[PDB]
Design a protein around this nucleic acid. Sequence first.
RNA 1: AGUGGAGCCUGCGGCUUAAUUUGACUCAACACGGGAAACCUCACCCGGCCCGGACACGGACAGGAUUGACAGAUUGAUAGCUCUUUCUCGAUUCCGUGGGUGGUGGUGCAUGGCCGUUGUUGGUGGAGCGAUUUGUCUGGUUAAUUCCGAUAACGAAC
Lengths: 249, 48, 134, 73
Amino acid sequence: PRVLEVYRGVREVLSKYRSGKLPKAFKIIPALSNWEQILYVTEPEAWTAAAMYQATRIFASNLKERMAQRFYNLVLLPRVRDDVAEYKRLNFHLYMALKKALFKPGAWFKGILIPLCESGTCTLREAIIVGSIITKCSIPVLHSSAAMLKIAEMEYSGANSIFLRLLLDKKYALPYRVLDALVFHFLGFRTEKRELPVLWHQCLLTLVQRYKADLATDQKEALLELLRLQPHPQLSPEIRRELQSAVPR
Amino acid sequence: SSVMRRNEQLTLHDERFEKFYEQYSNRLQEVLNDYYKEKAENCVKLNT
Amino acid sequence: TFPPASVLLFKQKSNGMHSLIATGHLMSVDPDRMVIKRVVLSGHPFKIFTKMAVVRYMFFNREDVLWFKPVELRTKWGRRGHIKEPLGTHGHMKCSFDGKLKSQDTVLMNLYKRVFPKWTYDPYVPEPVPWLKS
Amino acid sequence: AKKRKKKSYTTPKKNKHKRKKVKLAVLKYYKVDENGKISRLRRECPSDECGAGVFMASHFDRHYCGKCCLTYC
RNA sequence: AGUGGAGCCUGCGGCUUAAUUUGACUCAACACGGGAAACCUCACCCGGCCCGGACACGGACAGGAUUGACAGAUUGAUAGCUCUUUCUCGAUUCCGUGGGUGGUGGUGCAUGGCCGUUGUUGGUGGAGCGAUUUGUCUGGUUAAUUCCGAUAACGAAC
Ligand SMILES: [Zn+2]
């Protein structure tokens, strides 16, 4: 009816949005019930990066974490993956969109990071960009630990070690189940005949720099065995040195 | 769940894991009228 | 003084202590020996095309570029060029060069003046205290 | 290779605009008699979701809701 | 038939400009960048808001850190990215101090991923210590080491 043509009009507005105030019908989108229909009327695939930054701003600011999760999984993350794949870098507006999406961390981890990791096709540039984005944002310890348990339990991809390492650089107090999952993942790399890159070695090195004081002696010797079986000419002496000069408790 | 465990030295927080893995109108017409008024006020063409 | 002559240069350090800083001899006496002070001004070529570039931060006015237009520019990577035109009201300029410039390159200009010594001559010299090490 | 000089140049950006700090904003919401009866100075929001907790910004003529933007006269 | 002489238009130099954005200079420089640019299409100029990393240290924050915002007053811009109204949002923190500490950096070097099939000069022979030569040529023919034929050369690949 009359609502449909107004939302076609604001669809035409959002396809060319650069700056300024948006219509007030756009800002009351989360307060409505049938949001998916009017959102598909607004055609988010044809949005401008500034318009999607404002949409992420609005949707993150208005509570209801499940709906923010659905918006991040359905609209924001495909746009990010399409922009990295074609432009080989992330836009300024979309970068601040992902930061304002990390304003809501619970919908972010379960909507942006974990679906990207379980998609399997996550490239290295996407890993670097998203890891820098989680590096900039201060993250709650519970959400970071749950995401680290998630990424530890998953099947390995080369992009996963960057996320794991940049989560270990946060230097938070770690739950001991999380460290058990990390050690079990690395000891799951014990019998792999695949050549592992320097990224995996750097993730292990980071785990030994920051959490060597909270490692049991049995898993310490297991990590020494791990270094023995899967060596590197450069990093493995340093990981061995850091494991040798560690005090527990 | 693994087999090699924390052994000793304190439990600060218990952690909540069962929320991550276990997860998976008059105002409207008033805003429509405001949008129509704003679209009409872009070109006024009447007032002196 | 008619050469040869031994020459010593001391510095008054502290507490009446003379520290030897330089040793040498006397060269020919003349006031026509020109001493030239150099000042090197550096600019960043931020818009590079073939054999000519747009360079900033060497100047900040438009007529500073017109004042120092005749002076030939050189380059840390071995290029030699000359100012062609200023564009901005700020000190942005177009400069031609003999070759193509790298992105990591810097343009620079040498300016020269003649400098004369300061008349601070006085024959009185304080009597030194005996020398010791710190 | 050939390094750079890193021209410093001083530019004072210490002066930045921030919003004013309101201290103890809860005290003006309620007035309590000496007996212990609570009187609500500010209007309660009769909205769909933010009821019984959200007050009104008291304008010079009207009231404003701070979560769903409800306007009165 | 003209062009070069004339008026207009377009291109390149030059001259102006704050800017008159830009690679190419006798074919392959010259209506090439689908480039017939009033906003974008613009690479140029004159102004004006905004913020610009992690880590360490020192502050504030639960006696809200911070987020979101209707109406009105401003500057060249309907700037809640300032004021009157301060109402909500529950840590998702922002304020200084720093540091070859830098990372959505720039560039070079080394090596590898995605797809299948199994006119020039070599090989062997002859000449010379060798550079080299013969093949690749008397004649006729051909656009041509092509063809006919002669022949210390015979066979070939692109
Ligand atoms: Zn409200």
